[PDB]
């Protein structure tokens, strides 16, 4: 169920955000929230993220690796759109994806109030942790 799952999470979010709107229809901040967000045994996520994405292993992650992972997943690698998947969460330096940036994104998207932040890149992290 490789593509249909990225479609599930998508459609669930599409309904979730409609209900989030319904809620209002009826009736150092970054780090201070990061530290408290989920601190589960993320050695699974770290070892898995390096095992599936981190090839060279120097705190650096590009679009070529995500493109080849997408193609290996039997997915139709859109030639240039994967750049947006790399970019949507890049906040310090455009074309800089650090392991610390994985921590920040993973964490802000894992434990938060609403979500909606990208809803579209860490779905792949959810997939790799899923299988």
């Amino acid at each position: 169920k490789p593509s249909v799952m990225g479609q599930t999470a998508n459609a669930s979010k599409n309904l979730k955000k409609t209900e989030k709107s319904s809620e209002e229809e009826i009736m150092n901040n970054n780090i201070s929230s990061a530290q408290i967000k989920d601190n589960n045994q993320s050695t699974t996520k770290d070892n898995n993220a390096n095992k599936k994405e981190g090839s060279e292993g120097k705190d650096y992650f590009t679009a070529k690796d995500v493109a080849i992972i997408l193609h290996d997943l039997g997915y139709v690698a859109t030639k240039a759109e994967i750049e947006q998947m790399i970019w949507e969460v890049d906040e310090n330096l455009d074309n800089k994806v650090n392991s610390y940036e994985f921590n920040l994104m993973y964490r802000r998207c894992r434990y938060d109030k609403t979500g909606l932040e990208p809803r579209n890149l860490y779905n792949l992290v959810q997939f790799l942790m899923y299988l």
Partner: protein, 71 residues
């Protein structure tokens, strides 16, 4: 039908984006405040070093006159 569905979806997306934008604005204000505070605290550093310069100079200047007399 697909037109209206996707239009409502794009509406939700924009609402999301302005939420993210106002959040980033508030955290930018927080950055400004922390920055101003820390900059003052670090001005205190330069002042403390500058004063201890003179303190060290005085402590040496007294000893220089003491040397000749005690001998």
């Amino acid at each position: 039908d697909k037109v209206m569905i996707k239009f409502n979806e794009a509406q939700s997306i924009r609402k999301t984006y302005e939420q993210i934008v106002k959040r980033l604005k508030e955290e930018r204000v927080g950055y400004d405040n922390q920055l101003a505070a820390i900059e003052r605290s670090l001005k205190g550093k330069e002042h403390d070093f500058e004063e201890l310069l003179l303190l060290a100079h005085d402590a040496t200047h007294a000893k220089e006159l003491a040397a000749a007399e005690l001998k």
